[PDB]
Amino acid sequence: QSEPELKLESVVIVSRHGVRAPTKATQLMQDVTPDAWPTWPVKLGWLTPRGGELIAYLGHYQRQRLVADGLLAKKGCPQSGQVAIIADVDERTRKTGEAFAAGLAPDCAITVHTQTDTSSPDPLFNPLKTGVCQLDNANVTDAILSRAGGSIADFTGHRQTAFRELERVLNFPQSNLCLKREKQDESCSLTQALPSELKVSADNVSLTGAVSLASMLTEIFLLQQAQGMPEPGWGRITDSHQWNTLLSLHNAQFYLLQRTPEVARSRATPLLDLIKTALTPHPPQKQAYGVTLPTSVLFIAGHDTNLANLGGALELNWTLPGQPDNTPPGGELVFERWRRLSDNSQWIQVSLVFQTLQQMRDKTPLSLNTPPGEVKLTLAGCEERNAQGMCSLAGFTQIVNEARIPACSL
Ligand SMILES: [Hg+2]
Ligand SMILES: [Hg+2]
Ligand SMILES: [Hg+2]
Ligand SMILES: [Hg+2]
């Protein structure tokens, strides 16, 4: 029988937390719609039990997947120091680490390690926020505007179709913001009512106005859908074309703020370093958290921003069939190191594993027979590839070494 020419020796998964309740409930959010936003079963920004289940499903699937690839045993708890789970200090990331462990190795109680001080932010997930390093204001301002086509105005102008679709779902025309409009000489418009400005600081970048509101609102509609709520968007979202149109406003903000190299490289350095060191063969040592690397499987519970920063820094681009959000809840950036049996050469493969919006909505259990969506990624700047199109260890290491910003390493 034909035998595999490659052998999986290491897996590093950077995952976004699972489905959570919206992070905010502001006055603006209520003024752009005459309707009442549905309530959630958990606290704002917290993981919902359903979100935990969905993550557990992926954990269940990865276990079956890894067993078939021979990296994890089919029975029993993984051997000590074989599986490592790290998570940002947030409740939602911590719980995602627990949901994955429970799904990967039920009743095994794998430890979810986090930074010791959980009341302070973890630089691993954003070195800017803690001051490890800073953004070049002028340079970042120029790069974002450049990618925006010169101005945020031209940027939004090109997405008015998506913006009017959002207004339709919000019944924005009968909203307070619209009704108490002073300049009613003109038609109600989200981009007009809320001009979007680019704000760049040493430790942060943001978009004010309709761009960020739209990006948040559309994500909330997706969350309702994934959460299984009766009628996401008050029942005004009836087809896949509408889902994509709405979410495009979300992916668009991430394109500008999280994918832009001038922000991405810096923001992803700590993770880039952890990933490379975890994938590079070495004797069981550390990098932080009281966890030994290298190992066999490393699961990192983070955020969508991290997935986008890594994509931008590694020059990885993707679209997920059946999933309008490019960095969906539970979404996994999978890094694997395979060894070519023929000559013992090392190769790295990158994928994006995720549950389609329907698999979330229907809470469909995952397995080898019913796997989650998956897209094999190609490192744009990698020259030395193998038959399967994987990048060589050396090639990948070169890519990581040039993308990272040393001043931002931990
Ligand atoms: Hg720990
Ligand atoms: Hg190490
Ligand atoms: Hg490792
Ligand atoms: Hg998102």
UniProtKB/Swiss-Prot annotation:
E.C. number: 3.1.3.-, 3.6.1.-
Phenotype when changing residue 26 to A: Retains 80% of wild-type activity with phytate as substrate
Effect on the protein upon substituting residue 17 to N: Loss of activity with pNPP as substrate
Phenotype when changing residue 303 to A: Shows residual activity with pNPP as substrate
MF-aspect GO terms: 4-phytase activity; acid phosphatase activity; GTPase activity; inositol phosphate phosphatase activity; nucleotidase activity; sugar-phosphatase activity
Effect of residue 16 to A: Loss of activity with pNPP and phytate as substrates
Localization annotation: Periplasm
Keyword Protein biosynthesis set for record: no
Annotated Pfam families: His_Phos_2
Class in the EC hierarchy, top level: hydrolase
Residues where 1D-myo-inositol hexakisphosphate binds: 16, 20-24, 92, 267, 303-305
Effect annotated for changing residue 19 to A: Retains 70% of wild-type activity with phytate as substrate
Effect ascribed to mutating residue 18 to A: Retains 50% of wild-type activity with phytate as substrate
Result after altering residue 22 to G: Retains 50% of wild-type activity with phytate as substrate
Applied biotechnology: The properties of the phytase including the low pH optimum, protease resistance and high activity, demonstrate that the enzyme is a good candidate for industrial production as a feed enzyme and is therefore of potential commercial interest.
Gene3D superfamilies: Phosphoglycerate mutase-like
Regulation (activators, inhibitors): Contains three consecutive and one non-consecutive disulfide bonds and shows a strong dependence on DsbC for its full activity. Competitively inhibited by tartaric acid and by sodium fluorid.
Gene Ontology cellular-component annotations: outer membrane-bounded periplasmic space
Assigned keywords, A-Z: Disulfide bond, Hydrolase, Periplasm, Signal
Record note on temperature dependence: Optimum temperature is 55 degrees Celsius for phytase activity. Optimum temperature is 60 degrees Celsius for phytase activity.
Catalysed reaction equations from the record: 1D-myo-inositol hexakisphosphate + H2O = 1D-myo-inositol 1,2,3,4,5-pentakisphosphate + phosphate; 1D-myo-inositol 1,2,3,4,5-pentakisphosphate + H2O = 1D-myo-inositol 2,3,4,5-tetrakisphosphate + phosphate; 1D-myo-inositol 2,3,4,5-tetrakisphosphate + H2O = 1D-myo-inositol 2,4,5-triphosphate + phosphate; 1D-myo-inositol 2,4,5-triphosphate + H2O = 1D-myo-inositol 2,5-bisphosphate + phosphate
GO biological process, one term: cellular response to anoxia
NCBIfam families: PRK10172.1
Subunit organization: Monomer.
Protein name: Phytase AppA
Species this protein is from: Escherichia coli (strain K12)
Source lineage: Bacteria, Pseudomonadati, Pseudomonadota, Gammaproteobacteria, Enterobacterales
Gene it is expressed from: appA
